[PDB]
Design a protein around this ligand. Structure first.
Ligand SMILES: [Ca+2]
Ligand SMILES: [Ca+2]
Length: 220
DNA sequence: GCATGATCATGC
DNA sequence: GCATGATCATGC
């Protein structure tokens, strides 16, 4: 079930490319909800089971033996991303120590298997199709971009400007809330260096960044 | 129209 | 609350 090599994983992915969520779900005996409003990570999980990836909250890696991270990517009819891509929670405290090279973010984005999927809301969940696999590793430029944003956003977190951080900061990667809702709370750093309560934040890739990944693939 | 800010399920 | 998986939907 669990692929032993990259070749096997890419082969299994290519095998489910073109299937509908319904066909795949039924084949795996997984119940399909009416929509994603209250099952937001359903497609993600559907693919994990279909490709033999690590389920549950197992830390940072779907195919640890391969060093590959699996990520679904919703796209519209023109092949453009319908949503941003979550990368990982941001450490709002004790971030002291990590450099870009040894970041959770860089690690999770070092080798990604993107599985594009039909994401248009008007399409009945059961009828949406799974796209062809896209195996990606950031180019020099992409990492230069990712690194820049990471350092910028991290400095703010390390300097208590948590109250200045807005989803507008960052060219390709940004910080947006990540949790149950607006009342969720985590430990952070105050305007005066004191541990306070604040909203949990996570790193996300803007649609423009992932769209380029989709484009650089087509131009192949 | 769509990005920002909000929100939903689950296991421990 | 955190870490897994993300999409929703209101404000502009
Ligand atoms: Ca996983
Ligand atoms: Ca994953």
């Amino acid at each position: 079930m669990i692929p032993q090599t990259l070749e096997q994983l890419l082969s299994q992915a290519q095998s489910i490319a073109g299937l509908t969520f319904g066909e795949l779900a039924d084949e795996l005996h997984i119940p399909v909800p009416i929509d994603l409003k209250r099952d937001k990570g359903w497609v993600g999980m559907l693919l994990e089971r279909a490709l033999g990836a690590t389920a549950g909250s197992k830390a940072e890696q779907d195919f640890s033996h391969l060093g590959v991270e699996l990520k679904t990517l919703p796209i519209n009819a023109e092949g453009y991303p319908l949503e941003t891509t979550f990368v990982s929670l941001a450490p709002l405290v004790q971030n002291s120590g990590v450099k870009w090279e040894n970041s959770h973010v860089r690690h999770k984005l070092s080798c990604v298997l993107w599985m594009p999927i039909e994401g248009s809301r008007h399409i009945p969940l059961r009828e949406r199709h799974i796209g062809a696999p896209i195996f990606w590793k950031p180019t020099a430029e992409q990492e230069r971009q990712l690194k820049q944003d990471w350092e910028e956003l991290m400095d703010l977190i390390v300097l208590g400007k948590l109250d200045q951080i807005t989803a507008r900061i960052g060219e390709v990667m940004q910080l947006r809330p990540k949790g149950a809702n607006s009342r969720a709370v985590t430990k952070g750093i105050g305007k005066n260096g004191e541990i306070i309560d604040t909203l949990p934040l996570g790193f996300y890739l803007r649609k423009e960044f992932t769209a380029q990944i989709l484009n650089a693939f087509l131009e192949t």
